[PDB]
Amino acid sequence: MESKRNKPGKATGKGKPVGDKWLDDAGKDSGAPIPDRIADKLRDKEFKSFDDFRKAVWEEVSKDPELSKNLNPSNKSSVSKGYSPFTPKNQQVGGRKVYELHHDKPISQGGEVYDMDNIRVTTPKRHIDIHRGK
Ligand SMILES: [Zn+2]
């Protein structure tokens, strides 16, 4: 059966205060946190799937001047439509070229799918290292 990340749910969690260079943390240790201002927009909203949630995250990033400041024109256009933005080329891996959402406590260990304190923003390079080649 497919992963439970495909089932509907409501967003929970507080997120964390970040600065305008927040995505520079995505390629570090446990990636960057969901910003507290994004969590304040999405908490209690119902989503159809984790991919639906991901789209809402980037849409809210596009509407926050501070969080979207350092995105280039193409990436600003991507996030306004709910698409994940490209990371710097040195943090891409093969066909995986955009920021990825990672569950800190894995869903396989009971981690919650839509808990914004359990979701990190990572680069492809960092995320494939975290899961040892997957
Ligand atoms: Zn992960």
Side-chain angles (χ1 to χ4, degrees):
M1 191 182 275
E2 62 176 3
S3 175
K4 65 190 298 177
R5 64 192 314 122
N6 298 102
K7 294 278 75 182
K10 282 165 192 175
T12 53
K14 195 168 177 175
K16 297 276 179 45
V18 304
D20 56 10
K21 303 255 154 54
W22 68 295
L23 289 175
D24 292 1
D25 284 353
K28 301 171 176 158
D29 309 291
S30 208
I34 294 295
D36 53 4
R37 296 196 294 284
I38 299 303
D40 282 348
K41 296 304 185 316
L42 303 180
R43 184 178 315 112
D44 288 5
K45 293 199 167 167
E46 175 91 349
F47 296 92
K48 304 189 289 198
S49 66
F50 190 66
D51 190 65
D52 195 38
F53 174 78
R54 178 207 61 71
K55 172 178 183 169
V57 169
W58 292 117
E59 288 170 346
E60 295 300 329
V61 171
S62 77
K63 301 186 273 182
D64 190 302
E66 280 298 297
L67 295 176
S68 58
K69 177 191 305 183
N70 302 304
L71 297 181
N72 64 28
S74 185
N75 275 341
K76 282 192 162 72
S77 177
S78 291
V79 292
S80 75
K81 308 166 226 290
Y83 290 111
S84 309
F86 292 130
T87 74
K89 285 176 179 166
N90 61 7
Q91 284 293 309
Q92 304 177 5
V93 181
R96 288 164 64 173
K97 311 178 181 176
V98 298
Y99 295 92
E100 299 177 0
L101 300 184
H102 157 69
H103 290 90
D104 192 0
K105 186 167 173 178
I107 292 175
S108 57
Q109 280 161 233
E112 301 194 318
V113 174
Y114 301 97
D115 170 12
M116 294 174 286
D117 294 319
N118 189 43
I119 294 162
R120 311 291 298 190
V121 184
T122 63
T123 63
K125 180 63 164 67
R126 185 60 193 137
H127 202 194
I128 294 164
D129 285 344
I130 286 169
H131 298 297
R132 303 293 187 267
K134 239 183 195 195

